[PDB]
Symmetry: C2
Subunit: 648 residues, 2 copies
Amino acid sequence: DSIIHIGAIFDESAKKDDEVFRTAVGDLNQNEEILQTEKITFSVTFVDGNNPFQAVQEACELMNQGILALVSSIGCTSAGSLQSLADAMHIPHLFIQRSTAGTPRSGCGLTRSNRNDDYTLSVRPPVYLNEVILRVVTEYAWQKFIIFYDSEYDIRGIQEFLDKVSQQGMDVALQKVENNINKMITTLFDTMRIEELNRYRDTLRRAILVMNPATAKSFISEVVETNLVAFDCHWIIINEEINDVDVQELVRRSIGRLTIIRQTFPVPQNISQRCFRGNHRISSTLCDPKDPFAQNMEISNLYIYDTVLLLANAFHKKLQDRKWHSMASLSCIRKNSKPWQGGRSMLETIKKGGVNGLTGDLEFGENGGNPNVHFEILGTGVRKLGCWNPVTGLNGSLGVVLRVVTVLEEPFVMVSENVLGKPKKYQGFSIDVLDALSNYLGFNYEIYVAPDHKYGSPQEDGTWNGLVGELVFKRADIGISALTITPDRENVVDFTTRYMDYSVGVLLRRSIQSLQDLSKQTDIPYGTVLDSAVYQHVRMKGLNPSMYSQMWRMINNNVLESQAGIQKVKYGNYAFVWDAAVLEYVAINDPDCSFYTVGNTVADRGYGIALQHGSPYRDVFSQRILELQQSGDMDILKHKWWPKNGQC
Amino acid sequence: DSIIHIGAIFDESAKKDDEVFRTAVGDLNQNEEILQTEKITFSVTFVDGNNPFQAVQEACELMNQGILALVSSIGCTSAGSLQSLADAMHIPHLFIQRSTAGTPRSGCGLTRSNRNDDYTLSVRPPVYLNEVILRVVTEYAWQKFIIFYDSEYDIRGIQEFLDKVSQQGMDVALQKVENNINKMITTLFDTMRIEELNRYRDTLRRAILVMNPATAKSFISEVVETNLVAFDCHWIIINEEINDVDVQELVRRSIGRLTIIRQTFPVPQNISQRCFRGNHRISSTLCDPKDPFAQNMEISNLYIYDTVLLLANAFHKKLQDRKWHSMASLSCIRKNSKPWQGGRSMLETIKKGGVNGLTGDLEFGENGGNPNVHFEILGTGVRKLGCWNPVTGLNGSLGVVLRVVTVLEEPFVMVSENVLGKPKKYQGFSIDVLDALSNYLGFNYEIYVAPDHKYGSPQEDGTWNGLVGELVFKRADIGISALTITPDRENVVDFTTRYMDYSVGVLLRRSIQSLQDLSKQTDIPYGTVLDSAVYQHVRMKGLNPSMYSQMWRMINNNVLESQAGIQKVKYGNYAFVWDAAVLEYVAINDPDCSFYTVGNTVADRGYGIALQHGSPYRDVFSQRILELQQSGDMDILKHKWWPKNGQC
């Protein structure tokens, strides 16, 4: 004989809320401490969340069955109808808001009729998206950015945030991400001229993604493939429901800096205390983070569980104090439709209840809404940067001299000053990268050139020469130059991150437009320094498995050493293969502007900073090189010596 | 015996929809051509638009009464419940959307369950606000603007427009106008620094008001009083329901350029054809634009009228073809709830109906929505600039030599060049205003100075001297100088618009901060040119009814003529009263930067352009002077000679 019967109305896509609803029911019927001798029965109905009248009709049939409370897991479309019906029939309505397809939640904005008592309790906490996103952009001190939302977001969710940022003078644009992304980026190309397009690419340097993880994944991958974003972009993704499978896929798909903000549930750490809240035992499928279901649980599943646990404890108190109110068979829209007599007392019991659950500590304020909410902050691998909750706000914030061996190369390392009676000064891109590390890390340095001016080749003795050899023999601490990171060099010295990509380019005389064009004509013969790295590099590619075979066939007579190639293209018919960045500087700073550079191969290797093997600074230097890249300052220093302004 | 019974559900603030509903009922019962022998009865219910369950419950009681169709005049809050209920009971639902407090309409975004037939007909046309506002900003070629909406607008109404403008690279900010405006502008002052504030004032030069006329009136008056906007601002107000009383109050309260876009109803012009649509006679209170009620009719009142007229014609056809379907007593949420058998045929009849009404031609498309909508475009007095409708789109778009007499005055009219063997050239602010008129109007001119260098004083003979006298004797056509518009001069010559305000200022030597400070101390004695205009002007104010009395008491010994005042302040203790704009130029272009100017009285009179009495160009010249003011180009020319950059 059942005296406890609860109601459930579910949107059709809430199958997981039903499964956890039933399992929470079974778990409480096994708990002998709560409702020791009385069983809980239920009536579950699935309805179309887009039909508020269907939701009412099926809710009345549950009330006609006779229930103590109505739990609904449905969207804001039918929440207005279920909130006002509950007030009319005096049935406690534990409302769990579901967003469509995992999109970010927006407050229902219900402006519900306050003439009558509010019989609806919002189990889920308030949507603080505008508050959290405001703290993040204030910490990062953003001033111009664009906010993306998918086709399912309710932008009134940011109607306060758009006012706060407009009070603070920020250039904030919005933009819906269509359900057809490939067409959308393709569409942008037609509307905007080439001159206009750069502003969009520049704006996307700081963007905020308010969208479900699915569109977050596709939209990040789509822009990266179309190279609208670069290694300096900083995107913020915020959504309440973003599981770890999405986090790894977002980080794997994205370049640059990415900040993720999602809701977290403060739950015990111990393995024993993970499936126990006091003496209550939880089914392993929901509390064990090593079970596949628990990892695939929706956030709504957690609040469905803690709802039933709170209902049982609200029922347990009412029986103990002997103030119980039996269910009634209520009728809607009848001549004698009468409210549930015991609704008002049942409501006051539930509203003052509190439980420990999967969501954490569930409780209700005086307004009838759950006040507990916690967001974690992730950042790029990926790691936790801090916490946020609406009570504590934001938590977790978001010179020794070293021997430097160089090799002269314009514009990386050059002699800027050499006046009789003064110490030798240097300048260049490699020097500027060294100064930024010296300026931030707070180390000083003394720079000397390799005795033979060589980058370094392995000798038969087993001792390296050139710049690398100096670091082998501990004659220097750091090696700064146009040094490409090679496997051989990594064996003897330890490298940091690449601070720029090294490509093989060709110098032409004022018709060729690429190495491909270069590798198929014979009007202009071409070569590169004999037996040098670039000589071998074009050879090794040609020999083993479609231009490197036709490039090696030609160079293999037409070869030369050192600068002679630059002059050969100047006063002769010849295309010079060499480092593209060195050639690029040559063609830019040509006193007669007689050259242009093509090529720019896919960069197998890139420039690096070598330290003597086992250096304790490699890790920290790699950090600051990464930061200058992911902040764009490299693009400031690259423009100093490689300006595309138009001198030539 | 009644066989025609219709239903009505109204939001409580739809009293005017009920009154016109009943009067439309009486008007059709008098029409002997339509429903010749059968009367129409009705059941009207007023409900809270914020309670969708109350709307259903009271709708079921109307269906239980037995009705052929349900007309509802309510907001989108309860429209979802009434659209799906109608589909379930097969009751044709003529839905009229009401916005809250006259705020701009937004589409209900209902994503209504399409599994079943849609028994709801939207009597009101679709919301084309994003389309109309996009055409207006494209015509005006705006590139940076801010969009204001009141607390009642549903910004998803502009979710497409924000994407189109972001595709087009425009700097578009949004900003809700709080219901407390005085606090809001006061609040802005605290948040933003003085340097930041100018950007907001500069952005408001082009703003769009998407709000009800009430907040439009207060918000325009509030910014003008706080001088956040100036004579060059261009604001666009768009709303579907903006009656003429609002239009005149908006124009009276606003400065600058104002464009108003509102819905218009193409109705016959003739007095006879205003209250007749074929043989149908309309009550005078609704069709007569000279009746006070008809002028105070809501837009929803017009669609309530044409709804009943369409229902009667839909009923008239069904009786004539002998296909009628009698009403049924239907029950909601019952064991045997059954749909109205005759609903499907009644729906198809209504959907293919068409009537001439107050709204114009009412008809329905295949989607079940009214396709007819027309917007008019007003602009500043106020006049109609064009029309817009979604089918035709936008309609209505949005050198003889003259003798010029001048008077030398820096920096208005100055000799720029006077080299032996060349004609005399001139420069200055007054000249630049003349060149802009000569450049646009396409007239040429020859400039000569008044023989005596005088602006002009009335002689005893009755013949003016100076610059005015030349225009009296038709010796010149236009008078360009630092000429203030005086009543005496208006008597003999005709003036155009003021192209700048003339104020009385004081020159000080590097402590006084205003004429008020100036008019209360005696440490520094002060005067202005004897018996000149400024001498009299300070006198006349002092004599009749609090500083002009203390100013006249002092100057009344300390007076001087021409430049002597400037030198007196330079090499002596003395404050010089004179034209503030002439003094301002003097203090700016001081070779030793020894002066500053205070004062800037309220300008009773301002500079003007005089023409010989009865000139046919005064009107057109006044136009181009107005345009340069209301476009800001005067602020470009004023800065040429009065730059606040900081030379001194």
